[PDB]
Amino acid sequence: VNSFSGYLKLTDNVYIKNADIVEEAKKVKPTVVVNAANVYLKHGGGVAGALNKATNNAMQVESDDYIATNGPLKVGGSCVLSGHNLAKHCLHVVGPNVNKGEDIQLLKSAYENFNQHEVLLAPLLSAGIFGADPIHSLRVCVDTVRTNVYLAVFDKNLYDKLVSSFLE
Numbered sequence: 001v002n003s004f005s006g007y008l009k010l011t012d013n014v015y016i017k018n019a020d021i022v023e024e025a026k027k028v029k030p031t032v033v034v035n036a037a038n039v040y041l042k043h044g045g046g047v048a049g050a051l052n053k054a055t056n057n058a059m060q061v062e063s064d065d066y067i068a069t070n071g072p073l074k075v076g077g078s079c080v081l082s083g084h085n086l087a088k089h090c091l092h093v094v095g096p097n098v099n100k101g102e103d104i105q106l107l108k109s110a111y112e113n114f115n116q117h118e119v120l121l122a123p124l125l126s127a128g129i130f131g132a133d134p135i136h137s138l139r140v141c142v143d144t145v146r147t148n149v150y151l152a153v154f155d156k157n158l159y160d161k162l163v164s165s166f167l168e
């Protein structure tokens, strides 16, 4: 259960590893994997496309049924759906996409959703092509998340700049 291996503990509740979140999910099968989702839950590329493809589109079919019945999420919001073969549950969380003009204050609201789950495997919200400064996203995670979060960052160069900023 939640057999995370090779993480570096940054704070009492935040751990980090240079790894592909999809490979971590297949190995660990955590209770909750966080998806870096968008408001209409269309998993077209990046982390979301990679998680969806590893479920062989089961994630997208289920997401389409959620949107039909409930409408889109809001920026900073989330929903819990099945984790399929990757986890017991997937927490779809919408961080702001600053590359498309969304506000950075909503990154705190996005991280707040992690607090409803005791243990989560997660990506660095709003990083990559969402355009937020990745070190700033780590600082928001550290100040906001109180439950136990295992961050998988699939880039050694970025992993080392995060750990360097955090420890020195």
Ligand SMILES: Cc1nn(C)cc1-c1cc2c(N[C@H](c3ccc4c(c3)S(=O)(=O)CCC4)C(C)C)ncnc2[nH]1
Pocket: 019, 020, 021, 022, 036, 045, 046, 047, 048, 050, 123, 124, 125, 126, 127, 128, 129, 130, 152, 153, 154, 155, 158
């Ligand atoms: C793509 C891909 N293809 N396959 C097969 C695996 C992956 C893969 C990518 C990836 C990952 N990337 C990081 C990241 C973090 C957050 C966001 C993005 C990207 S984004 O998709 O550009 C926009 C949404 C927010 C980078 C900063 C290194 N972090 C962990 N696991 C990952 N797995």
